[PDB]
Amino acid sequence: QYNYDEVLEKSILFYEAERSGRLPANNRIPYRGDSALGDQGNQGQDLTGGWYDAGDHVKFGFPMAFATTTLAWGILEFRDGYEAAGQYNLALDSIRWTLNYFLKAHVSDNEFYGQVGDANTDHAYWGRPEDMTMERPAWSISPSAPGSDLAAETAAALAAGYLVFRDSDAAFANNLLAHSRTLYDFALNNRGIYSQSISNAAGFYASSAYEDELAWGAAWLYRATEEQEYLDRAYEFGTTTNTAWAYDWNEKIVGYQLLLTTSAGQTDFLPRVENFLRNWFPGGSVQYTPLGLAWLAQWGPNRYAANAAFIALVSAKYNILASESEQFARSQIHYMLGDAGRSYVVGFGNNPPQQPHHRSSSCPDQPAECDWDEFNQPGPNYQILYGALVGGPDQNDQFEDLRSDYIRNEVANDYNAGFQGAVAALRAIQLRD
Template sequence: MIKFKRLKSALVSSAVAVSAFVSPLAAVTPSLSANAADGDNYAKLLQYSLYFYDANMCGDNSDCALSWRGNCHTNDEVPGGFHDAGDHAMFGQPQGYTAATLGWAYYEFGDAFDSTGQTAHLKVITDKFAKFFRDATVLNGDTVQKVLIEKGEGNADHQYWGPPETQGDRGRMLWSTGGAANVTAEYAAALAANYVNFKNPDDLKYAKALYNFSKQNPATYSCEFYGSGESGSADELAWAAGWLYLATKDEGYLNDLKNGPLGYWVMNWENVALGAGVLLGSITGDWSHAPELGNLSGDGYKFYDKWGSARHNATAQMCSLVAAKHGKG
């Protein structure tokens, strides 16, 4: 019974942790089945949560599972990727975080995706993220020359109220030649996680290059909508190092993970130190970098912030579930 409850919790937390809402699906013909083990249809909840990403796909959307989405922004310098939270700009930092966290969900709870028939859909989504991160990275051999970290402009985008298919050319493409490690290391983490899960060698090649690029210039980039915060890029670098260690078993990456910051707050797009700490614990048994786990009170709902408190609570549950799976209490 405990194991089954954990399976249900894993379905909920890993689906909800990186999505703010689930899109209405009344007009949608599901392209994949979802099979629940009991009357509480957690399988359907997982399935519907994944449609959130189909709703936010950008570029060539021929692989989108929603019939009412079409191609959009195909004239971008680098087409593809995913729109931001309900608008149509593309910000690299939360996009990289989202892709890496989805990869983590599958890495730890792949049996839940498999048994509910959702693995194929999840792979479409994470592969689409990975393709954009590769396409957004200009390489010279194994050395990164520049990386596309934003598309569009947030304030201008917020003035547009309509579908992305009719928005037209959004113009601005922001490239980085270094000093945006909080963004580019997230790309590296997402690509490494996707390699661990699905073994595309190009994902690993670009992950390594982006990690080296980020480590060589760990300065950070912030904009009005997303910033590096107090954590700088140390958390993203540790997070990426953990995934690269899982992908390669190179002790150098493990040493970088061990030297990462402690996770004193909930994992989120700005600070992934707790996720890195849980990775370290699951790999080595050293949980000292994940001290925030388990500090609940009252009814157990961990309230971190009034802005999106449910996403923080769901991500805290996911981190705790992973830690519990690997023997931490």
């Protein structure tokens, strides 16, 4: 009913359109060029690369890392689906981009750059990333500026990256794992909330707690190394009694619960995984729009539902409530692909969103001017931002498709992270069935 190969191709193109830094010779996004080549640490350390977080040009390390961990997990679990779609090598290239940035950002054992760009001055600008001239400060976490959440999430992404790459690029993968170990030790021994230490982040990606990141990073390092000390750390900071509200960049609870249940064969966490799934299934504790979207909140409902669908499809692969998980997950992804009458994936399907809240796609082809006129103009973004999952409709399925609707027309790295893995899982089920 939907071409998952095309969805996967375009989702990876969305991430490619988010790239910062010096772009490769085989860049597939024609309107994007080199940008932010001056991004650097306080001692001149190269910090070029990474992804712009959303429709802005800030490099927010916390969601960037979580998006990478979630994408890597889906590549591991649904490799068969990526392979069948012809998108496996492109998916690896996709997250190689951010993994390389995390390596650059880890300038020493106990210092990690967690943001480049002042979000206040960045968001006051509307124009191309290639045309930026404002100062782009860089801030780090360190013993004097702890960030156990940011550091452990990045350690999780690096450990997941080690697992993804170790059978094709061992030198790269081994470097990722070494930095994962070091960053996780840093997170454990220098405790605090990264968005208190990098205060510019608190208006955008404020972390509510870091203990779930500590359990998540431990669970990933246990998968990567099989060393008992990490499994111990996962039980130390993990919960067997609380059920996650959502799976997202702030809350890792059901992520590590499921990871420990499936990869590590632990049984203590399975009841909380099943609680989460049943809370999201029809008849649970998450309201559905009339036309069938599981709608947790006005803030990126597609993101929350796609994240839950991803969790459900990993669960199904390990035969946890498989039938209900697959039906629920498929219903949510298919809503986003166009079941309610329009696609919510830019550049895909029937009547996709035309005005994503996204600077570079809002600009006409070079050398035309791009400024706030292009924010306000009432027609479609000049460039098609293939693959971007928009925030989504209100609770009554309504969607105005206006660039100024910074809630419903938002796009972001984390919006696509669970979504893309869920699509690969659905492609994989087609091979099975």
